[PDB]
C-alpha cells in the first residue's frame, strides 16, 4: 500500500515575489560626502554570488519596486544633506549689474554689485560677484537692474562646499529572509523569463550619477548593444539604450575661477565667482568621432530589428534643462549642447556647454539649490554607457529626457527581490510513532 | 505520601495589571488629515470574537494611565504635524486698522500692514480683516493695533494641505497584552466590574476637542450616567454622559472669501477677503424641550447621592475657558452656553464669536492660526455629556478643567492588562 503521510520540511528552497526596503551599503572633512554614514553602512565588501542551475524566473524591470523605492530615497537624503546649509533668502535684492566688459568681454556672463546684510544686522555693504546669465533675468527692457532666476517662486539653499558631490558606489542589501535574484543572460530583454539566474545578498556597485540624455559610468552590456522599453510599438514611452563599447567623454572648464566669500549675514556666507585668472575660453566636451559614429551606427543596427531608415534628431526644444545633456562634473552642473551628435541617418567632435548654478535638478519642482563654484581648473573623464531616446511615430529618435527614474532602471534591470518561504509540506511513506 | 508533582501549563488564563505603550488602528488624497491613517497602522476594523463569563475585575478610570500616555501622544502627533508649513514671524508688524464699515457690522477690523514683496528691496501695504479677539491695543488713541500672540510666540498657520477632520481611532495593545472591556450598563468608572470582556483593540475613539460639552462621544446604554473621583470634595470635575443625545446645529451664515498674501519667499499667508451675501453673527441651535428634557434626567443621579438642583453659567476664567469652544467645519468657535444652564429644579440661540489664533491647551508655548474656510459653514453633531462642577441650595456650573478629562469619557470601559500565559500547580501526574 502507498501509506503516505504529511511531512514538514523547514528550509526548502522556494521564494515568493514581494516588496520590501533594502538598506544601503557603500564604500568608504566631517560629514565628508553625500553618501556618508548618514544613510549607509560604510566600507562593506562586495561579497560572493550564489550560482543557480536549472532555474527559470520572469523578471520585469518596469514593475520592479526597487526603482520606485530608490527614487524617494535619493530625494530624502539629498534633502537631508542640505538641511543645515544656509537659506539663501538674504540674497534676494535688486542687482546693479552691467556687461562683464573685462579682459584677462565674455558672452553669457555678467558683473553684479548688490547690497548685503553684513555680519551685524545694521549697515549695508556694496559687495559684488559675477553671475552666469542663465541664473539671472533682467527686469526692464533697458537690461539693467537684474534679478535672480529663482527668487520669485522659492528661494533655496546653497550647497555647502564641505560636502562632496562625488557619487561613490552604492550597494543595496536585502533583509534576512529575503534574497536578490540576478539575471545573467548575455542578451537580456528587461522582461520575460531568465534561463540563466543567480542570487546575491547585496547588489553590485551602482554609481548614482544624475544625468539626462546620456547615462555615464553605468553598467554595460557584454556584447550587442541592447534596447529596453515598456513597449517598442508605443511612442510616448521612453526607450533606454545601454552600450557595450564605451565611448570616452572628456569635459572641462579651461578657466581658472577664483572663489569669493561674501559675508551675507550673521554667521552666514554666500560663495560666488571671483575675478578670473589666465586665458579665457568657453567650456566644452570632447567625444571622439569614429567611436560615437561606430556607437551610433551600432544602436541603429539593433534599433531596426524592431522596425522591419532610422533618423536621429535634435532636442525637443523648450526649457534648457530637458533639452540639454545635464550632468555634474564633480562639483559644477554642466549643460551641454548635444545637437551636434543626434544628427544622422541610416577625429574629435566637440560640444559647447553652459553652467547653471541655480538649479532644480528634479522633475519634482519642490526643490532648488545653488551649487557654489569650484575654484581652479576642473576636468572630468567619463564613459558614455547609455542613451535615452524618444519617438514621435522612417522613425526619428530624439535624445530623451523624461522621468528621472529611467536612469536607475538602467542599473537595476538585473535584480528582483524575492521573499523566502522556507516551510514545505509534502507526503512521505514515513510515519510518526 | 500524597504523591503530587509540579505540573506546568502554557496558555493559562492569568493576567496582571500593567502599563505599556499602544499602537493606533483606524479605518481606511495625499496627506489627507492630521490623524493620518498613513501614520497609524490600519490593521483591522473588526477584531470581535470575544466573550467572558464569571469574571470580576476592579477598574479605576481616574488612574487609567492608558489615557495619560495617549494624552501626551496625541499632543505629540499634532505638534509634529505642524513642522512643514510656515512660521508667521513676518506677520509681527504694527497694524493700522479702520472700522469694518459699510461695504457696517462690527467684531472685525480692516487692518492693513506692511509686508515684503518678492525682493527685499521693495515692500507693499496689504489689507485684511481680523477679529478683535486676535488683536490688542498699543496706543489708546484707537489705532496701531498689535497681534495677540506676538509677545509669546511666532504662530504657525494651519496650512490646509492637511486637515483636522477627526476619523475614528482604534487603540490596540501590542502582542502579549489585552484590553479588558467593562460591559455593564451603569458602570460608573471605578470599582469592581462584574460583567467584563476583552479585546485586542478599542472601538472607534473620536479625537474630539471641546470644552463644557462632549460632542460625537460615547453614550451610556440607557439612563444617563455620572462619574467623579469623589463627590464630597469639589476640586475635580464631574463627567456627565447622555444616553439620549441632543442634536446641536452650528452655522456661520457668511460667504467669506479667502485672500492670499505673499508674506514670505514661497510662503502663502491666508487672510479674510471681502464678505459676500448677507451678514450674520455665528450662532448655534439646540431645540427647547429636546434639550431641557435631559437636565431633568441628570438631576436624578445627582440627588441619588445628594439628599433641588440648579444649573448656572460658567464659574469664571478667560474667554478660552468661560465658553463652549469647539471646531466646526475647520474654523474654531468659542460660544456661550449661558442660554442653556440657566434653570432651576422652538430653537434656543447661542450667539458667539470665532477666533483664528488658538491655543486650546493650557500650554501657551505653542500657537496655531487656523485660516478661514471659504463659503458658509454649518455642521450637526450629537451632544452626549457635560463637564459640570459643584459649587456647594447646591448649584452646579459647566466647567472645563484641563483637557484630558474629555478622553476619559471614551476610555472608561477599557483597561490594558498583560498576559501571563504560564501557570504551575501540583498534580498526581509525573514525568516518565
Amino acid at each position, epitope marked *: 500500500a502507498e501509506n503516505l503521510w504529511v511531512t514538514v520540511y523547514y528550509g526548502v528552497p522556494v521564494w515568493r515575489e514581494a516588496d520590501t526596503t533594502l538598506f544601503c551599503a557603500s564604500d568608504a572633512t566631517e560629514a565628508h560626502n553625500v553618501w556618508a554614514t548618514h544613510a549607509c553602512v560604510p566600507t562593506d565588501p562586495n561579497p560572493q554570488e550564489i550560482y543557480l542551475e536549472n532555474v527559470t524566473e520572469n523578471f520585469n524591470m518596469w514593475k520592479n519596486n526597487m526603482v520606485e523605492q530608490m527614487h524617494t530615497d535619493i530625494i530624502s537624503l539629498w534633502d537631508e544633506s542640505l538641511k543645515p546649509c544656509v537659506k539663501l533668502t538674504p540674497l534676494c535684492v535688486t542687482l546693479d549689474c552691467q556687461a562683464f566688459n573685462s579682459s584677462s568681454a565674455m558672452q553669457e556672463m555678467k558683473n553684479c554689485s548688490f*547690497n548685503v546684510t553684513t555680519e551685524l544686522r545694521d549697515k549695508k555693504k556694496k559687495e559684488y560677484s559675477l553671475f552666469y546669465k542663465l541664473d539671472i533675468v533682467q527686469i*526692464n*527692457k533697458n537690461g539693467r*537692474q537684474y534679478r535672480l532666476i529663482n527668487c520669485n517662486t522659492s528661494a533655496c539653499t546653497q550647497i555647502c562646499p564641505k560636502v562632496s558631490f562625488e557619487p561613490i558606489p552604492i550597494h543595496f542589501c536585502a533583509p534576512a529572509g529575503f534574497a536578490i535574484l540576478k539575471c545573467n543572460e548575455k542578451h537580456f530583454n528587461g522582461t520575460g523569463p531568465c534561463k540563466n539566474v543567480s542570487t546575491v545578498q547585496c547588489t553590485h556597485g551602482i554609481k548614482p550619477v544624475v544625468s539626462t540624455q546620456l547615462l555615464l559610468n553605468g553598467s554595460l552590456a557584454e556584447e550587442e548593444v541592447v534596447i529596453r522599453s515598456e513597449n517598442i510599438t508605443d511612442n510616448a514611452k521612453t526607450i533606454i539604450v545601454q552600450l557595450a563599447k564605451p565611448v570616452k567623454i572628456n569635459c572641462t572648464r579651461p578657466n581658472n575661477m577664483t572663489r569669493k566669500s561674501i559675508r551675507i549675514g550673521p554667521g552666514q556666507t554666500f560663495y560666488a565667482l571671483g575675478d578670473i585668472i589666465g586665458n579665457i575660453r568657453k567650456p566644452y566636451c570632447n567625444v571622439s568621432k569614429r567611436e560615437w559614429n561606430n556607437t551610433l551606427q551600432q544602436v541603429a543596427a539593433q534599433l531596426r530589428k524592431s522596425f522591419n531608415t532610422i533618423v536621429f534628431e535634435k532636442s525637443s526644444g523648450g526649457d534648457l534643462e530637458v533639452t540639454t545633456h545635464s550632468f555634474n562634473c564633480g562639483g559644477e552642473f554642466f549643460y551641454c549642447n548635444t545637437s551636434g551628435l543626434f544628427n544622422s541617418t541610416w577625429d574629435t567632435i566637440t560640444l559647447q556647454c553652459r553652467i547653471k548654478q541655480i538649479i532644480n535638478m528634479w522633475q519634482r519642482v519642490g526643490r532648488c539649490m545653488y551649487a557654489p563654484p569650484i575654484p581652479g581648473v576642473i576636468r572630468c573623464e567619463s564613459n558614455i554607457t547609455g542613451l535615452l531616446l524618444t519617438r514621435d511615430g522612417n522613425e526619428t529618435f530624439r535624445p530623451g529626457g523624461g522621468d528621472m527614474r529611467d536612469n536607475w532602471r538602467s542599473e537595476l534591470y538585473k535584480y528582483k527581490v524575492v521573499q523566502i518561504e522556507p516551510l514545505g509540506v509534502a507526503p512521505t511513506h514515513c510515519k510518526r510513532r | 505520601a500524597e504523591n503530587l508533582w509540579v505540573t506546568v501549563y502554557y496558555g493559562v488564563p492569568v493576567w496582571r495589571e500593567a502599563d505599556t505603550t499602544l499602537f493606533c488602528a483606524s479605518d481606511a488624497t495625499e496627506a489627507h488629515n492630521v490623524w493620518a491613517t498613513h501614520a497609524c497602522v490600519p490593521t483591522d476594523p473588526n477584531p470581535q470574537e470575544i466573550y467572558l463569563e464569571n469574571v470580576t475585575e476592579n477598574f479605576n478610570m481616574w488612574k487609567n494611565n492608558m489615557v495619560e500616555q495617549m494624552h501626551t501622544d496625541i499632543i505629540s502627533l499634532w505638534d509634529e504635524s505642524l513642522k512643514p508649513c510656515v512660521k508667521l514671524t513676518p506677520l509681527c508688524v504694527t497694524l493700522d486698522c479702520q472700522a469694518f464699515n459699510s461695504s457696517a457690522m462690527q467684531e472685525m477690523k480692516n487692518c492693513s500692514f506692511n509686508v515684503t514683496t518678492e525682493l527685499r*528691496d521693495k*515692500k507693499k501695504k496689504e489689507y485684511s480683516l481680523f477679529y478683535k479677539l486676535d488683536i490688542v491695543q498699543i496706543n489708546k488713541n484707537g489705532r496701531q493695533y498689535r497681534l495677540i500672540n506676538c509677545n509669546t510666540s511666532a504662530c504657525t498657520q494651519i496650512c490646509p494641505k492637511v486637515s483636522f477632520e477627526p476619523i475614528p481611532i482604534h487603540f490596540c495593545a501590542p502582542a502579549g497584552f489585552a484590553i479588558l472591556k467593562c460591559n455593564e450598563k451603569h458602570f460608573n468608572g471605578t470599582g469592581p466590574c462584574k460583567n467584563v470582556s476583552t479585546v485586542q483593540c478599542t472601538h472607534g475613539i473620536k479625537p474630539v476637542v471641546s470644552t463644557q460639552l462632549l460632542l460625537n462621544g460615547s453614550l451610556a446604554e440607557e439612563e444617563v450616567v455620572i462619574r467623579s473621583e469623589n463627590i464630597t470634595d469639589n476640586a475635580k470635575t464631574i463627567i456627565v454622559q447622555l444616553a439620549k443625545p441632543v442634536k446641536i446645529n452650528c452655522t456661520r451664515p457668511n460667504n467669506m472669501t479667502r485672500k492670499s498674501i505673499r508674506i514670505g519667499p514661497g510662503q502663502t499667508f491666508y487672510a479674510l477677503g471681502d464678505i459676500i451675501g448677507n451678514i450674520r453673527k455665528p450662532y448655534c441651535n439646540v431645540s427647547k424641550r429636546e434639550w431641557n428634557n435631559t437636565l431633568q434626567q441628570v438631576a436624578a443621579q445627582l440627588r441619588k447621592s445628594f439628599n433641588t438642583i440648579v444649573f448656572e453659567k460658567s464659574s469664571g476664567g478667560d474667554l478660552e475657558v468661560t465658553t463652549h469652544s469647539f471646531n466646526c467645519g475647520g474654523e474654531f468657535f468659542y460660544c456661550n452656553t449661558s442660554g442653556l444652564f440657566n434653570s432651576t429644579w422652538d430653537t434656543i440661540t447661542l450667539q458667539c464669536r470665532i477666533k483664528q489664533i488658538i491655543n486650546m491647551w493650557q500650554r501657551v508655548g505653542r500657537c496655531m492660526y487656523a485660516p478661514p474656510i471659504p463659503g458658509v459653514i454649518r455642521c450637526e453633531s450629537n451632544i452626549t455629556g457635560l463637564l459640570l462642577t459643584r459649587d456647594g441650595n447646591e448649584t452646579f456650573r459647566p466647567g472645563g478643567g484641563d483637557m484630558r478629562d474629555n478622553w476619559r469619557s471614551e476610555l472608561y470601559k477599557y483597561k490594558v492588562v498583560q498576559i501571563e500565559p504560564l501557570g504551575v500547580a501540583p498534580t498526581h501526574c509525573k514525568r516518565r
Partner: antibody
Amino acid sequence: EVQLVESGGGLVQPGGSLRLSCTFSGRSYHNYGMAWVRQAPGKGLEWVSSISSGSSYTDYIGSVRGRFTISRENAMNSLSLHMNSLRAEDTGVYFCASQGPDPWYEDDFGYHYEVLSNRFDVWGPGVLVTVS
Amino acid sequence: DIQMTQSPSSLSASVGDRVTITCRASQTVSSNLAWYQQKPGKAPKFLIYDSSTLATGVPSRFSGSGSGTEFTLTISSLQPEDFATYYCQQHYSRPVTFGGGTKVEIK
C-alpha cells in the same frame, strides 16, 4: 530724461475692444506706477485708471469700472490698456502718464514702496480714440 | 469723492504781468494738490506738487499757496511760454479728478 510713446489707437465701431499701449523709453521702469488720462475735445482731463509699479494695486474711475482692464509687463517696459466694450462717449484723446517714482524711505535695509502717488509726472504725446 | 473746481473760467493778462489762478475743493485736503500746464497741441506738463513744491523742469516763476484749502497758483511774471491752459488736481485720495480748467489771454 523719461519719454513715452502710445500706439494702437484708431476708429472702431461701438462695443469694440480697441486696446491701447504705452511704451517706456527710460531706465528704472521697475519702480514706476502708471496711469491713463482721458481728454474729450474741449473738456478737462479725466482720470481713467492706475496700476502700481508692482501691479498689485490697480484702480479705476467708477465711470469705467468693470469694463476696462489695465495691465503691464515689466520685462518689456510697456503698459497695456486692454479696453473692452467701448461706447461713443469714450471718445477723446488718451495719454499714458507715469506716477512719480516710488518713494524711498531707507530705514532698515533697502526700502522701495508701492503707493499710487497720484502725481502724473510725465505724459506721452497722446493717441486719439474715436468710436462712431 | 472730492469735487474740484476753478474760478474764474479765464483771465486776461500780458507779458510781464503777475498772474493768479484759484482752485477750490469741496472736501478738505491737507497739502496734496498739484497743477499742470497744457500747451495746445501737446500733452500736459508738471508744475507743482504738495501745493508748494516745484517740478524738476519748471523755470521757477511759479509758486503755490500751499495752506488751508483755498489753493491758488501765482506767477511772478508772465512770459509767452506760460501763456497756456492750466489745471489743478487733488492727489489726496482716489478717484482723481481735474477741475474744469482755466485759460489765459491777452490784455
